């Protein structure tokens, strides 16, 4: 489950760049690794890299 | 931030009355005089003068709160007399004594200055 934005609010900061919660960065890591792992299945790859 | 202005202790606010009179209903012939923007100076002299009056049964004063500028004077007299009368006569006596004292101080100053 991905919590709503109110659980991990992103605050408009002095620098115009928006600020992201810790949970959002962790979810970004999870999505990246999930997508990479999905790529290494639709096209076969060494069981070592999958592990 | 919450400091009262210094003039607040002696200047009457708009609509505020200098003196109010109420009856003390516990006992007969007793009145409470509330005076605004006065302190121990007047209260003490008035009370002491009232205690000099043989027809006054009770006289006392108090400042209910030092951060407020009110005095309460309670006066009880004999039934043949009135607390209003006693209060008025006490002020008259105090004024007379002060006038005499001022005259005599003037005379003493003149004597001292001449020699």
């Amino acid at each position: 489950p991905v919590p709503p934005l109110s659980v991990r609010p992103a605050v408009v900061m002095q620098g115009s760049a928006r600020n992201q919660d810790d949970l959002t960065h962790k979810l970004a890591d999870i999505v990246k690794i999930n997508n990479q792992l999905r790529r290494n299945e639709q096209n076969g790859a060494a069981a070592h890299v999958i592990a | 931030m919450n400091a009262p202005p210094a003039f607040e202790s002696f200047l009457l606010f708009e609509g505020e009355k200098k003196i109010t009179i109420n009856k003390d209903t516990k006992v007969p012939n007793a009145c409470l005089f509330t005076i605004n923007k006065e302190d121990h100076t007047l209260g003490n002299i008035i009370k002491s003068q009232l205690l000099k009056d043989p027809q006054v049964l009770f006289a006392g004063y108090k400042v209910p709160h030092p951060l407020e500028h009110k005095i309460i004077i309670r006066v009880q007299t004999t039934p043949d007399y009135s607390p209003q009368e006693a209060f008025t006569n006490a002020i008259t006596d105090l004024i007379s004594e002060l006038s005499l004292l001022e005259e005599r101080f003037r005379v003493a100053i003149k004597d001292k200055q001449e020699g």
């Binding site: 609010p9 605050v11 | 931030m1 919450n2 121990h40 003490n44």
Partner: protein, 49 residues
């Protein structure tokens, strides 16, 4: 002597010069009250401080 009445005080009073300090803690830097002001983003409870 009592200032209000001018009467002497029955007990005599210990009095003299003593070095006193004014500390930095002043009430006007501490007094605070709130009635529905700003709230935190994450929980919607009143801010701290």
């Amino acid at each position: 002597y009592n200032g209000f009445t001018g009467r002497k005080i029955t007990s005599q009073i210990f009095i003299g010069p003593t070095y006193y300090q004014r500390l930095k803690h002043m009430v006007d830097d501490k007094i605070h009250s709130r009635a529905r002001g700003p709230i935190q983003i994450l929980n919607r409870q009143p801010m701290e401080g």
